[PDB]
Design a protein around this ligand. Structure first.
Ligand SMILES: Cc1cc2nc3c(=O)[nH]c(=O)nc-3n(C[C@H](O)[C@H](O)[C@H](O)COP(=O)(O)OP(=O)(O)OC[C@H]3O[C@@H](n4cnc5c(N)ncnc54)[C@H](O)[C@@H]3O)c2cc1C
Ligand SMILES: [Cl-]
Length: 487
């Protein structure tokens, strides 16, 4: 007979899952498996992102239960669990969506040879990205494009991405009954308390495929907003209704298919001939994700500076005092501190909000390494993506792709263009809720009488600015110019 395993790592969804469709084909029993390392915390990761993953697994569990099946959350490591369940369940075929991250390449290679000894077929479709990223490199002559302009000219020569896979059957072959490793008491989806977390998550974005499809349909409620979407023109201070889709955590964990997003975009574009074009368009934003995956997967040490062939070698400062102030949202600049507070409470900020805080730490004011700042974002971002976090932190540090180090955002004036009343600041920094809008971006310039009337004295209730931006940015730009000259 045919007994199969659909292994979930990313792609936590039932729609557009070519691995699941193959796993269910002619199968007597299908085993939906997610491998969980219970010692992950005792080895880093916020409860915001981990609970978002748990909520995603609960959505998969309710979707499988509604079709006569059941999600199995196996504890342990894949190299140790799979050899056992192969022979316990009589597995003949193992299916899982392809992954191009460095750890996945080593992990899958080990499971591929474990399945071979067990006489198990391995099927690994590509569905996390729009295209086969190895195909894009081969068609480009054997190298990956290093600019968005050249990348977009390549994908347009390749053509449309593959259409999203059809839906799985309404009834799925269930796991075999009375299997010891498939017992519900050891294969259930745990909560954030049971995995060893003390404080609860505070984010407002719920995980799972159902929420991903609901936020997708809400974004496409106004097709004119979708067709005329221009990323550099969106509002980073909009928090009640974010100015962008906020689909990045769903796309990261695979709760939403990128190919489904792309096909829905083309449907709107055919009806709106004046739709925006890449890179500013919504489709361009998916291409940014596709471009950074293509470059990073073919570049060694892409998440580091040393040994990175695309990253410039800058003598970043080792200043733990400045890093602690930026990380703990006490820089003394309310625009920066409010975004850093939104980072640790929601796990998501607007793209230009991330521009402000990444530039402030690196080439703008503090001259701290982009690796140190990437580590802080990897812990708290619920949309943390290995290749996307890395490429964008090298972008904002003027280490790769971007090179115009004279463009320095001001921590005072950037947000004031969008939100002169400081509504974004008053929300995430309630210690400044009574400060008048004249000084809300520069609280150290408010008279002492005003600081007391507002109940926020600089130095007692809110810290003073750690640096003078006019002086700090002048020094940072001079050092960046001396670096691009020694190259
Ligand atoms: C320092 C820094 C770190 C970042 N780290 C991450 C990260 O870990 N994970 C992450 O998903 N994005 C990251 N980004 C990119 C960007 O900030 C987010 O993708 C965006 O804020 C997500 O909002 P959205 O889903 O509403 O995007 P939209 O504007 O609605 O775009 C839709 C989708 O396109 C993709 N996308 C959009 N912008 C980019 C971009 N600049 N690069 C790559 N893909 C993009 C995402 O999948 C996103 O969900 C980072 C950017 C910076 C400056
Ligand atoms: Cl500015």
């Amino acid at each position: 007979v045919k007994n199969s395993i659909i292994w979930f790592r990313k792609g936590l969804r039932l729609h557009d899952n070519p691995a699941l469709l193959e796993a269910c084909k002619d199968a007597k029993h299908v085993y939906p498996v997610f491998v969980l390392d219970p010692h992950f915390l005792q080895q880093k990761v916020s409860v915001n992102r981990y609970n978002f993953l748990l909520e995603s697994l609960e959505d998969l569990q309710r979707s499988f239960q509604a079709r006569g099946s059941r999600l199995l959350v196996l504890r342990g490591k894949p190299e140790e669990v799979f050899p056992r369940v192969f022979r316990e369940w009589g597995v003949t075929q193992l299916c899982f969506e392809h992954d191009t991250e460095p750890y996945a390449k080593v992990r899958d290679a080990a499971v591929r040879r474990l399945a071979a000894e067990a006489g198990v077929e391995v099927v690994t479709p590509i569905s996390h990205t729009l295209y086969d990223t190895d195909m894009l490199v081969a068609r480009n002559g054997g190298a990956a494009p290093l600019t968005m302009q050249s990348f977009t000219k390549l994908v347009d020569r390749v053509g449309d991405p593959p259409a999203p896979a059809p839906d799985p059957p309404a009834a799925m072959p269930p796991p075999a009954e009375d299997m010891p490793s498939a017992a519900p008491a050891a294969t259930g989806v745990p909560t954030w308390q049971e995995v060893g977390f003390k404080e609860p998550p505070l984010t407002v974005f719920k995980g799972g495929e159902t929420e991903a499809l609901a936020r997708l349909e809400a974004a496409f409620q106004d097709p004119k907003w979708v067709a005329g979407f221009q990323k550099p023109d969106t509002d980073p201070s909009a928090w009640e209704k974010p100015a962008t889709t906020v689909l990045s955590p769903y796309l990261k964990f695979g709760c939403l298919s990128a190919r489904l997003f792309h096909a829905r975009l083309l449907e709107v574009y055919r009806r709106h001939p004046a739709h925006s074009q890449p890179p500013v368009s919504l489709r361009g934003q998916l291409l940014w994700r596709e471009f950074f995956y293509t470059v990073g997967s073919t570049t060694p040490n892409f998440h580091r500076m040393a040994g990175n062939p695309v990253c410039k070698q800058i003598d970043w400062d080792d200043n733990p005092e400045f890093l602690a102030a930026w990380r703990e949202a006490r820089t003394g600049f309310p625009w920066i501190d409010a975004i850093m507070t939104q980072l640790v409470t929601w796990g998501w900020m607007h793209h230009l909000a991330r521009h402000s805080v990444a530039c402030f730490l690196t080439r703008g004011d503090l001259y701290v390494s982009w690796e140190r700042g990437m580590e802080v974002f990897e812990e708290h971002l619920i949309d943390q993506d290995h290749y996307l976090n890395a490429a964008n932190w090298m972008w904002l540090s003027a280490s790769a792709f971007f090179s115009q180090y004279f463009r320095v955002y001001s921590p005072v004036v950037f947000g004031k263009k969008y939100d002169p009343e400081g509504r974004f600041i008053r929300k995430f920094l309630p210690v400044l809720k009574d400060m008048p809008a004249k000084y809300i971006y520069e609280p150290w310039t408010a008279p002492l009488e005003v600081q007391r009337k507002a109940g926020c004295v600089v130095g007692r209730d809110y810290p003073a600015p750690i640096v003078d931006h006019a002086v700090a940015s002048k020094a940072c730009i001079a050092r960046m110019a001396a670096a691009y000259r020694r190259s």
